[PDB]
Amino acid sequence: SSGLIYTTKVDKELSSIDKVNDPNINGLVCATHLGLYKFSPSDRSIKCVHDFITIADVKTGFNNYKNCIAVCNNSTAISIYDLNKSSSIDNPLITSLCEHTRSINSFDFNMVESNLIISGGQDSCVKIWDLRSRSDISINTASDSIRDVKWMPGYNFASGYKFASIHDSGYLLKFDLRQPAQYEKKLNAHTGPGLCLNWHPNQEYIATGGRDGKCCLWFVGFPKLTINTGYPVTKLKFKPAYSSNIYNSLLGISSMGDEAEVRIYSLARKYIPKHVLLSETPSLGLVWWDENLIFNIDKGTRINGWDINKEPTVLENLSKNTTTWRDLDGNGLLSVDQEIGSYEVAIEPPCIITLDIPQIFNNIRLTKIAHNSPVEKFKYLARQLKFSYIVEAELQEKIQTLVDLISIATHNASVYLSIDDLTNFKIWILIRDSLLWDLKWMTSSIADPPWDTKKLIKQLYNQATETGNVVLTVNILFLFQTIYQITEIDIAKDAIAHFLLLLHRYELFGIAADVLKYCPFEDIMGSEGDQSSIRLFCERCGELITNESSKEKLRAEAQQTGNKKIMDKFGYWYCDSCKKKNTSCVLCERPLKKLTMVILPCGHEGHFQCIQEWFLDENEQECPGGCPGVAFI
Amino acid sequence: MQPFDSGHDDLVHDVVYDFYGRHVATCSSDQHIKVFKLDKDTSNWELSDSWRAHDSSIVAIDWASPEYGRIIASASYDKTVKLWEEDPDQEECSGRRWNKLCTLNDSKGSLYSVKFAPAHLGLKLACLGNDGILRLYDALEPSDLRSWTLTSEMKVLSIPPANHLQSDFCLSWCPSRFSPEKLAVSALEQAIIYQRGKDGKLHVAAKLPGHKSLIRSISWAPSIGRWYQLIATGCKDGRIRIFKITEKLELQSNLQVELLSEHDDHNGEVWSVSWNLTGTILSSAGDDGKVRLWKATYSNEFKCMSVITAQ
Amino acid sequence: PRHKYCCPHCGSSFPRCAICLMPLGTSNLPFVINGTNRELVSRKLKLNEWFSFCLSCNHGMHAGHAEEWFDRHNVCPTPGCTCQCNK
Amino acid sequence: MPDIKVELLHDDIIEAYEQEDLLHLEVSDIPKFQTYIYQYSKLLFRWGLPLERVKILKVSTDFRSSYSSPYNG
Ligand SMILES: [Zn+2]
Ligand SMILES: [Zn+2]
Ligand SMILES: [Zn+2]
Ligand SMILES: [Zn+2]
Ligand SMILES: [Zn+2]
Ligand SMILES: [Zn+2]
Ligand SMILES: [Zn+2]
């Protein structure tokens, strides 16, 4: 990234990291490794490594104890170390402290009183020791498993006598040095275990976190702010600064697992992070060196460092506006009228701008010329136009095709002239006269002239598809594609499919059915053939109602005779296998042949009039046949 | 129609229509999706549902085809894609109306773009994110909506991006029902068209040139009868680019790319482009609160038709 | 399955409507079938989206779609079928 | 709701309203109108039609003055 400054690699595994609280030197303590990892801005490397010789986090001392490092090794005692006592002759051990009967989960040096330390763990007891001298003061936590205990920070800028505890019982317990065995403030932090505890650097605000994934801010001087991270949060480290307002606090939310990243949240914007600092491997711990630099360790054992004053902001990269269209003219066109805020003091609710572009444009036009409703026009031209057409024999068929295409062109010109748009009446008059020219040369029987039928029809098609007249180009594609090869079959079929999808986008379905019923291209919408076919099994014998014998007999009788009305006797209301006579209506018990109305949960037929009368006029809710249920409405 | 005020507590990122234009789904960074409905009475927008979908900023949304039900799909910065099917029995503005179907938590990076395929491909879904690979999720049996299988895992980049926070990905499908399957990938600064050959696998078909900065949007155009196809790309640099794609019938068709027009009229950063249903008028929204409409002139060159200001 | 009917063996939806190409047997469609005293109007609107089919050509429609189609035409809306389902 | 400002830029309807001509012809549309009209005027003068050549030359000269001495003294 841009703000990345320091990086290296470690040959062995790491567990935690802490900062040497010293403005003179620029080292770090990484946790059984305990290395004084010193970084230098001249080379941007942490190659200066002083090789000084579990569920724990390493911590360094403050104030007069400016050189003490505590780490847990055997999970039963706290081991103190000194950086000055790192020589070969000098013993690199300080007097250890051991009273915990179970595993130690946390410990922390105090920032105001250097001779006082705190810890905790699964032993359900918070103890206080002394470094100048078994603990001195022990506080029972009522069988609550301590995960984190942190001191109240001093943080001398332009106190330290209290501490809090997070627990597996989801309770935040504020304590006091001068008030042992009695918690000062008790708060129910989270449902389930709470795994995070830290204090705000300036104000008395405590931000926690646990298995609920809700980083909740608590006032200790139902929560103040709630950040629904969703993942189990494991670590929080506030930035070192003077935050006069509590909303201008940069907080490092991090988790442990296969998806771990350094996320630096500002409390002013609890929904967008400010830095999503990410490494090649999942991270484990993050610490703040100063007001700018923050380091981390990872599963890949790389001591990466970032500069938050030279990092891109996540808010700037996020999408700010969007547009979509609803139809051809632009009856519905959207935006978002949202303002970008800051990470310091949240946002007014954004306004989605739905605009009637044709109405606004007509208003501005009529205003400009003083010194309608083209969706209805599209409906009118979809409904009222004639899209459908339906060796001497071929000549006669071609002549008849030209004649009734002339008739269709005349009808289209007339219905354009009915609504008074001359710009397409002229087009269809041109097409009609070109067809008349072709008809007169069929009856009478270097580049082509511009009044040639194929060339002129193709040029009018190209002008229509460049201008945006969907209806006219689609009409030309139905009427003059097979006889005049205008474009490829793929382009024509795609245009017809897009026109039918456009008709489906409006509530114009009968028009789309009219268009698809007489389409010369047989595979426009769907490739399964009969997608509306409903084959039935017999209610008496159980075999499928195919009635092939009846169809064969009626086809033979209609072939031997000269009428097509014999084939109207074919139907699926009777069975040929079991000789079922007819299907009866559920209300009137009359024969039912041509249109039914199926009741869904019980499977009963019925006329439109019978079912409609029973369910609207009589206002009944059950099936007429009698069924254990309600087939309402 | 009139503008309406959402209940969103932060920025709205992606807004997508349904098929019929009667429903608007707005996904935002406050971990929320708000689906609105267009009432025939009084001609104003009323809220229908508003529920929490993800644990981070939802950056993309898309409706499915109307024949497969009321399905939206949300991609966010939680490295997940979650689908939502509407249950009409529940009351409106209750939060239990839209029920989760499946969570496609397979990306190692945060997902930026989700797009449904055209309805003639089946219920097919696409994903692009910070990992740098294009993922295709198909329901081979559309009987059950909870059975999604990853059918294509194509690497659109030579290397994954090291700078993960400075990236933006977009996808756009080709709505041509009878042309071969085409998909547009705008990964970081390129734009690659992907076709399906006889092998059943995606292949690189053509590359849109230019694009000096990050690509914030891409939009294929619905060509109703045209002999060419249009792709509109919006960039971080602020330049609208319209590419004239021509197709002539291992891939079954070769593509030639000609930059038809270039427009830097947004003095800033372009965040979205979207054609209309004719493929003639193109919208373009910038970071200045301005929306411009582009229509092709008599020559093969688009020009700005209007500017929409939101004072 | 009080709002959506499917095959119990495989889960596939019903055969599609011949007018709007939506799968039949599903209530609460995205549109309103305003086919050819507010309670009776609402009952008619929710009655228009039912399962109606002809017993001579076996082609399915919504009730409102079949009522609106056969108020202007007299042939089955499926391509390739010549069956006067009205009378 | 905010206030939305709409600014039409090069609207075709306004430009059609601002045009008194049926067509906006140019010299690029008809490159050789002068020579063809002049030669047909010469051919018309060779016939017994001396007014038609004056009509056609008046049309040509009107268009030439639109996009831009034997009878003087
Ligand atoms: Zn039978
Ligand atoms: Zn009856
Ligand atoms: Zn019944
Ligand atoms: Zn089945
Ligand atoms: Zn229907
Ligand atoms: Zn039929
Ligand atoms: Zn029938």
Coordinates of N, CA and C in Angstrom, one line a residue, chain A residues 363-436:
Chain A
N363 N -42.3 20.0 -20.7 CA -42.5 21.3 -20.0 C -41.4 22.3 -20.4
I364 N -40.2 21.9 -20.4 CA -39.1 22.8 -20.8 C -39.2 23.2 -22.3
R365 N -39.6 22.3 -23.1 CA -39.8 22.6 -24.6 C -40.9 23.6 -24.8
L366 N -42.1 23.4 -24.2 CA -43.2 24.3 -24.3 C -42.9 25.6 -23.6
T367 N -42.1 25.6 -22.6 CA -41.6 26.9 -22.0 C -40.7 27.6 -23.0
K368 N -39.8 26.9 -23.6 CA -38.8 27.5 -24.5 C -39.4 28.0 -25.8
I369 N -40.6 27.5 -26.2 CA -41.2 27.9 -27.5 C -42.3 28.9 -27.4
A370 N -42.7 29.2 -26.1 CA -43.7 30.2 -25.9 C -43.2 31.6 -26.0
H371 N -41.8 31.7 -25.9 CA -41.1 33.0 -25.9 C -41.6 34.0 -24.8
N372 N -47.7 13.5 -26.7 CA -47.6 13.4 -25.3 C -47.8 12.0 -24.8
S373 N -47.1 11.6 -23.7 CA -47.2 10.3 -23.1 C -46.8 9.2 -24.1
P374 N -45.5 9.1 -24.4 CA -45.1 8.1 -25.4 C -45.2 6.7 -25.0
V375 N -45.4 6.4 -23.7 CA -45.7 5.0 -23.3 C -47.0 4.6 -23.8
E376 N -48.0 5.5 -23.7 CA -49.3 5.2 -24.3 C -49.2 5.1 -25.8
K377 N -48.4 5.9 -26.5 CA -48.1 5.8 -27.9 C -47.5 4.5 -28.3
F378 N -46.6 4.0 -27.4 CA -46.0 2.6 -27.7 C -47.1 1.6 -27.5
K379 N -48.0 1.7 -26.5 CA -49.1 0.8 -26.4 C -50.0 0.8 -27.6
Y380 N -50.3 2.0 -28.1 CA -51.2 2.1 -29.2 C -50.6 1.5 -30.5
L381 N -49.3 1.8 -30.7 CA -48.7 1.2 -31.9 C -48.4 -0.3 -31.8
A382 N -48.2 -0.8 -30.6 CA -48.1 -2.2 -30.4 C -49.5 -2.9 -30.6
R383 N -50.6 -2.3 -30.2 CA -51.9 -2.9 -30.3 C -52.5 -2.8 -31.7
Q384 N -52.4 -1.6 -32.3 CA -53.2 -1.4 -33.5 C -52.5 -1.6 -34.8
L385 N -51.2 -2.0 -34.8 CA -50.5 -2.3 -36.0 C -50.7 -3.7 -36.5
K386 N -50.3 -4.0 -37.7 CA -50.4 -5.3 -38.3 C -49.0 -5.8 -38.5
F387 N -48.5 -6.5 -37.4 CA -47.2 -7.1 -37.4 C -47.1 -8.4 -38.2
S388 N -48.3 -9.1 -38.4 CA -48.3 -10.4 -38.9 C -48.7 -10.4 -40.4
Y389 N -47.9 -11.2 -41.2 CA -48.3 -11.4 -42.6 C -49.6 -12.2 -42.7
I390 N -49.8 -13.2 -41.9 CA -51.0 -14.0 -41.9 C -52.1 -13.4 -41.0
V391 N -44.0 -24.3 -61.6 CA -43.2 -23.1 -61.2 C -44.0 -21.9 -61.1
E392 N -45.2 -21.9 -61.8 CA -46.1 -20.8 -61.8 C -46.8 -20.6 -60.4
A393 N -46.9 -21.7 -59.6 CA -47.5 -21.5 -58.3 C -46.6 -20.7 -57.4
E394 N -45.3 -20.8 -57.5 CA -44.4 -19.9 -56.7 C -44.6 -18.4 -57.1
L395 N -44.7 -18.2 -58.4 CA -45.0 -16.8 -58.9 C -46.3 -16.3 -58.4
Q396 N -47.3 -17.1 -58.4 CA -48.6 -16.7 -57.9 C -48.6 -16.4 -56.4
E397 N -47.9 -17.3 -55.7 CA -47.8 -17.1 -54.2 C -47.0 -15.8 -53.9
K398 N -45.9 -15.5 -54.7 CA -45.2 -14.3 -54.5 C -46.0 -13.0 -54.8
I399 N -46.9 -13.1 -55.9 CA -47.7 -12.0 -56.2 C -48.8 -11.8 -55.1
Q400 N -49.4 -12.8 -54.6 CA -50.3 -12.7 -53.5 C -49.7 -12.2 -52.2
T401 N -48.4 -12.6 -51.9 CA -47.7 -12.1 -50.8 C -47.4 -10.6 -51.0
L402 N -47.1 -10.2 -52.2 CA -46.8 -8.7 -52.4 C -48.1 -7.9 -52.3
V403 N -49.2 -8.5 -52.7 CA -50.5 -7.8 -52.7 C -51.0 -7.6 -51.2
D404 N -51.0 -8.7 -50.4 CA -51.4 -8.4 -49.1 C -50.4 -7.8 -48.2
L405 N -49.1 -7.8 -48.6 CA -48.1 -6.9 -47.9 C -48.4 -5.5 -48.2
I406 N -48.8 -5.2 -49.5 CA -49.2 -3.8 -49.8 C -50.4 -3.4 -49.0
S407 N -51.4 -4.3 -48.7 CA -52.5 -4.0 -47.9 C -52.1 -3.8 -46.4
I408 N -51.2 -4.6 -45.9 CA -50.7 -4.4 -44.6 C -49.9 -3.0 -44.4
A409 N -49.1 -2.7 -45.5 CA -48.4 -1.4 -45.5 C -49.4 -0.2 -45.5
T410 N -50.5 -0.4 -46.3 CA -51.5 0.7 -46.3 C -52.2 0.8 -45.0
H411 N -52.5 -0.3 -44.3 CA -53.1 -0.3 -43.0 C -52.2 0.4 -42.0
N412 N -50.9 0.1 -42.0 CA -50.0 0.7 -41.1 C -49.8 2.2 -41.3
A413 N -49.8 2.6 -42.6 CA -49.8 4.0 -42.9 C -51.0 4.7 -42.4
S414 N -52.2 4.1 -42.6 CA -53.5 4.7 -42.1 C -53.5 4.8 -40.6
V415 N -53.0 3.8 -39.9 CA -53.1 3.8 -38.4 C -52.0 4.8 -37.9
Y416 N -50.9 5.0 -38.6 CA -50.0 6.1 -38.2 C -50.7 7.5 -38.5
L417 N -51.4 7.6 -39.6 CA -52.0 8.9 -39.9 C -53.2 9.1 -39.0
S418 N -53.7 8.1 -38.3 CA -54.8 8.3 -37.4 C -54.3 9.1 -36.2
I419 N -53.1 8.8 -35.7 CA -52.6 9.5 -34.5 C -51.7 10.7 -34.9
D420 N -51.6 11.0 -36.2 CA -50.9 12.2 -36.7 C -49.4 12.2 -36.3
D421 N -48.7 11.2 -36.8 CA -47.2 11.3 -36.8 C -46.8 11.0 -38.2
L422 N -46.5 12.0 -39.0 CA -46.2 11.9 -40.4 C -44.8 11.3 -40.7
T423 N -43.9 11.3 -39.7 CA -42.6 10.8 -40.0 C -42.5 9.3 -40.2
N424 N -43.5 8.5 -39.8 CA -43.5 7.1 -40.1 C -44.6 6.7 -41.1
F425 N -45.6 7.6 -41.2 CA -46.5 7.5 -42.4 C -45.8 7.6 -43.7
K426 N -44.8 8.5 -43.7 CA -44.0 8.6 -44.9 C -43.2 7.4 -45.2
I427 N -42.7 6.8 -44.1 CA -41.9 5.5 -44.2 C -42.7 4.4 -44.8
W428 N -43.9 4.2 -44.3 CA -44.8 3.2 -44.8 C -45.3 3.4 -46.1
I429 N -45.5 4.7 -46.5 CA -45.8 5.0 -47.9 C -44.7 4.7 -48.8
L430 N -43.5 5.0 -48.4 CA -42.3 4.5 -49.2 C -42.2 3.0 -49.4
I431 N -42.5 2.3 -48.3 CA -42.5 0.8 -48.3 C -43.6 0.3 -49.2
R432 N -44.8 0.9 -49.1 CA -45.9 0.5 -50.0 C -45.6 0.7 -51.4
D433 N -45.0 1.9 -51.8 CA -44.7 2.1 -53.2 C -43.6 1.3 -53.7
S434 N -42.6 0.9 -52.8 CA -41.6 0.0 -53.2 C -42.1 -1.4 -53.5
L435 N -43.1 -1.8 -52.6 CA -43.7 -3.1 -52.9 C -44.6 -3.1 -54.1
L436 N -45.2 -2.0 -54.4 CA -46.0 -1.8 -55.7 C -45.1 -1.9 -56.9

